[PDB]
Amino acid sequence: DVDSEAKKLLGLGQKHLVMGDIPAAVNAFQEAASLLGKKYGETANECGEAFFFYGKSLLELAREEEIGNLELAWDMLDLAKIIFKRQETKEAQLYAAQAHLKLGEVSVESENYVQAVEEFQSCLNLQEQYLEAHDRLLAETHYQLGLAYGYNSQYDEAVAQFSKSIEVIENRMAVLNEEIEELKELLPEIREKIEDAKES
Amino acid sequence: LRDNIQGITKPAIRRLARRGGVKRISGLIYEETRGVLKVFLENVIRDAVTYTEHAKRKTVTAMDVVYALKRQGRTLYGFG
Amino acid sequence: REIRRYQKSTELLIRKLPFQRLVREIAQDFKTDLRFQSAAIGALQEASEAYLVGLFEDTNLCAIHAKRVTIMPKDIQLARRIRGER
Amino acid sequence: MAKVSVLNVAVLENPSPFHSPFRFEISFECSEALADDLEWKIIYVGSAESEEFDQILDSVLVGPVPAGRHMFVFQADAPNPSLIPETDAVGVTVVLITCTYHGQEFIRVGYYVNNEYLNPELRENPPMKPDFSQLQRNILASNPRVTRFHINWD
């Protein structure tokens, strides 16, 4: 019953994450995470997935009480990150990678870049650890990492991350031969970021 | 006593610790923390002041410092 | 749940004036005729905090790896080496 | 910036007894043909309390280095148990890999290393002098640390 209601609450929550309703998503996760931590304990890993999505909606809701949302989003992402860092499976580790991704993005909006690049460097370590050479998640993080650098005035290092990201797209554009439209139109986003990065 | 002058309080030290995920510290942390920082500042001050004499400045500013720290070393959590 | 905190970005965890006198005496072991622009100090300030938060990130790691919670100086020395500058 | 870029390192057959040789799979990329020599090192930190107990395990000197992707595997024998202070012998320590473009360190990758007993009683009550044959070396592949110093590449 608790396990049953919680899983759909996570469903309806991400279904508010498509709907565009941010607070509703946030509260779907609050109680969901509330039910899990109150049943299994705040240490238990069965809280992790709800913990992640909880810390995920609060980040979206952060857009002048933003830092407060930054607090709780950081905590839940940090709780989920160690819940996953414990489990030695592929899924949980990549979930800790995703947790590190969001942690890093929680830092750039926090304008805490030094830690942001770190969490992106951490997410990349675990993705690289596990994913394959032509996986779109590597470009999901190289890109992110380049901008965070740009935000930190490390413009040369920023461009390089961008290049690794675009190359991740181009190389998967080879086995896709023997989503091609989808890659074509998000390449302009990165080239614009490239031309602007060291331009400063 | 002059060699005992400090630049960071004990409150700050535990603050910096917990934000790196540290949960508890031993009593000797405060000295070690203060010991290694001095070294850091030693290594840094020298370079920035060096460039102040290299840039032949007197009121040395950050523009020296940041070059003096790009000279110190950047630790990242992976290879990508 | 004793897990990592975070900053606000508004100001520093280090007072500049106790910091500055330390800067002063460290630099005066080298020479006796020196002066320092407040900008230079603030630069050293943030650099200090940065290095500190880095080693604490590593210090807790190895401390984690021995079955332990309280951190020992050896862990600090160790994190200094896994960076490595001595 | 740098004319060389270490793409990735990989620690192999981890964990293993204390006495077994290290095995890393290293891969880098030279942006240009390199004239001078590249020197890779493995260093085992014998004591945290003093770099004096650093033990340079192996080193390879390569030069000139072409441009492009390179990969090799660095194997180095286990560190000398006779040179380790017995305090530092069982516990957590560090191992390092460094490269050197004609005499200057431009990169230092580092790992924690946990040496444990697995015999249940030896972890329970360890012998005064460490039984290195009975020790196991678990390097931390999960958490590398790469420190890059900027140098002259001319």
Numbering used by the authors:
A (entry chain H): 38 to 100, 170 to 284, 299 to 320
B (entry chain C): 22 to 101
C (entry chain B): 49 to 134
D (entry chain D): 1 to 154
List sentences from the manuscript.
NASP is a major histone chaperone for H3–H4 dimers critical for preventing histone degradation. NASP and its homologues share an atypical tetratricopeptide repeat (TPR) domain. They constitute the SHNi-TPR (Sim3-Hif1-NASP interrupted TPR) family, predicted to have four TPR motifs with the TPR2 motif being interrupted by a long acidic region, a capping helix region immediately following the TPR4 motif, and a disordered C-terminal region containing a nuclear localization signal (NLS). Here, we report the crystal structures of the sNASP dimer, the complex of sNASP with an H3 α3 peptide, and the sNASP–H3–H4–ASF1b co-chaperone complex.
